Amino acid sequence: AKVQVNNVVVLDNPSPFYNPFQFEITFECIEDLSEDLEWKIIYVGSAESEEYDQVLDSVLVGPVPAGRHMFVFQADAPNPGLIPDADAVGVTVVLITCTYRGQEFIRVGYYVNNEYTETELRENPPVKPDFSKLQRNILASNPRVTRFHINWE
C-alpha cells in the first residue's frame, strides 16, 4: 500500500451526542500519487439496515504529496431525525474510510455507545429517545482495521 495509516486518535471523547466527531489521523504516503485521496466518516444509524447510514463528512486532496501527513478530521453529529428509535440508545458503529481513485483501501470501525447519564433516564428511558440527554462514548481502545488491496498505479 502506497498510503499507510499510522495512527487514529479519537478526540473529545466521551461527549454529548450533538458534539462533532473529531479524529486526529496520521498517515504516510510512500510515493507521490497523481490522483485523489478521499476520507469519509460514516455513521451507522441502524445496525438493522444500511439504508440509515449517514455520511457525516468527507475530505478530498489530490494529487497526494509523498511524506507524513496529519490532520484532525471533524464531522457534525448525525441527524437524529434519520435514526430509528430502536437504534438510538445503545451500541452502534462509526467508520472512517479512505479511498484512492475511488477504491476503498482502508476502513477503521469503532463501536459507539450512546447512553443517558442521569439516573431517572437510565431507569425510565423515554419511549421517544431524547438526544439532548444522550452521551456518545466511542470505544476508542480497539478499532477494527480492515485493509483492501487496490490498484495504486
Binding site: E48, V93, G109
Partner: peptide, 9 residues
C-alpha cells in the same frame, strides 16, 4: 434484526 452488531467489519 440486530444479529449484521460483525457493520464494524
Amino acid at each position: 434484526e440486530k444479529x449484521x452488531x460483525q457493520r464494524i467489519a
